[PDB]
Paper text:
The influenza virus RdRp is a heterotrimer that includes the polymerase catalytic subunit (PB1), the ‘cap-binding’ subunit (PB2), and the endonuclease-containing (PA) subunit. The ‘cap-binding’ and endonuclease functionalities of RdRp work in concert to perform the essential ‘cap snatching’ of host mRNAs to generate primers for viral transcription. The essential endonuclease domain within the PA subunit is a particularly attractive drug target. The chemical scaffold for our studies is 4,5-dihydroxypyrimidine-6-carboxamide (DHPC), which was originally developed by Summa and coworkers (Merck, Italy) into the first-in-class HIV two-metal integrase inhibitor raltegravir (Isentriss)30.
For carboxylate analogs (e.g. general structure 6R = OH: 6b: R1 = naphthalen-1-oxymethyl, 6c: R1 = 4-chorobenzyl, and 6d: R1 = phenoxymethyl), we generally observed the DHPC warhead engaging the two-metal center, as expected, and the R1 group stacking onto Tyr24 in the crystal structures of the inhibitors in the PAN binding site (Supplementary Results). This mimics the binding of a nucleotide base in the native RNA substrate, which may account for the potency of these inhibitors. As anticipated for a carboxylate, no significant activity was observed in the viral plaque inhibition assay at 50 μM.
Author numbering:
A (entry chain A), B (entry chain A): 1 to 53, 73 to 196
Amino acid sequence: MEDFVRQCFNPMIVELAEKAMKEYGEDPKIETNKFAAICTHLEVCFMYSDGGSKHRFEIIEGRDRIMAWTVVNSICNTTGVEKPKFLPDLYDYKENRFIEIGVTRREVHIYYLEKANKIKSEKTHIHIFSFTGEEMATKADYTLDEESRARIKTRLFTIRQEMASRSLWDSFRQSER
Amino acid sequence: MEDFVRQCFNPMIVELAEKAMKEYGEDPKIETNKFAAICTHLEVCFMYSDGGSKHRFEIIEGRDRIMAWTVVNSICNTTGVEKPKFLPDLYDYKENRFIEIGVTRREVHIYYLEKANKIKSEKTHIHIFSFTGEEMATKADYTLDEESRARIKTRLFTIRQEMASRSLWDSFRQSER
Ligand SMILES: O=C(O)c1nc([C@@H]2CCCN2C(=O)COc2cccc3ccccc23)[nH]c(=O)c1O
Ligand SMILES: O=C(O)c1nc([C@@H]2CCCN2C(=O)COc2cccc3ccccc23)[nH]c(=O)c1O
Ligand SMILES: [Mn+2]
Ligand SMILES: [Mn+2]
Ligand SMILES: [Mn+2]
Ligand SMILES: [Mn+2]
């Protein structure tokens, strides 16, 4: 599974995931499933910010803590939108809202409720994806066009198939909570 | 001059410049001219990467050292281009070359020679801008279109005028070497 991650994900995503795990005392060599989950979530967030017009989204995930809050606070001062208690993943300049992106191996509705009642913030938009092709967003507002969401859902589908071909999918799908 | 920097530059550029100065033992409150020079160089590099087609440029400046070399090494493994000895500022996916960007207050030809004989690498492309409107590149290959270079040269012109209106230009133009 470790060799699959460094093979199907770019070195920039792999390095970001390795730093996030080591910041919590986890070895990517041992918790290889969470290693892949972080890479997958990072890849989806980067594809999400490329699926609209130019400069429509500001990336917050992947940045270090100080720069991430520098971007968040700069937006709240310029646009007046409320400041989130936790770091979101994107900001929609067109819709004037923060975006939280989730990638689940289980069911898409369980992850939305778990992330909605955990974020608590009324303004932050939520958009969940899954490896089987489902997606659900806040109030059915999927932000992106059907073509940009299709390449994200197809990308997750391709990842699921490659690990299934490598007999790594069921161990990955199982270890989510 | 310190109040001008935090006013005319976004908080993301200001925070990046403050970190770069503190990594060398310099206080942005005292060396305010180098504080502005770092912000200006960062702003030009970010506008440069927005002046072509989407995904035409990869940003290397502004990243921390580990991520910057992660991007550089990933490009040298994917495209086979030679690995630079020093971190460049951008990579041109269309031209398959690294880009070094310079912003000088003096003359544009002195800065090109000083940066050419210092980089020594034959493949790295050089592109210098100035606050008065001059620009020169490697072998007259300016990479960008005249419209994208115009908004960069106009931006530097606007910066020069605001500090001149604040009686800060001549102290800034003088402290370059
Ligand atoms: O998309 C998501 O599900 C998502 N979830 C989070 C949650 C809730 C807030 C904190 N947190 C973390 O995961 C912190 O990191 C670790 C938490 C626990 C164990 C970890 C082990 C290795 C690496 C990171 C870890 N934070 C988001 O920014 C986000 O996008
Ligand atoms: O554009 C350019 O002129 C440009 N110049 C450089 C030069 C040469 C390589 C090192 N270096 C530095 O400036 C390092 O930082 C400090 C060097 C010295 C003093 C400093 C004080 C405060 C903050 C940074 C400082 N490096 C580029 O990446 C680049 O883009
Ligand atoms: Mn996140
Ligand atoms: Mn997320
Ligand atoms: Mn540089
Ligand atoms: Mn430079």
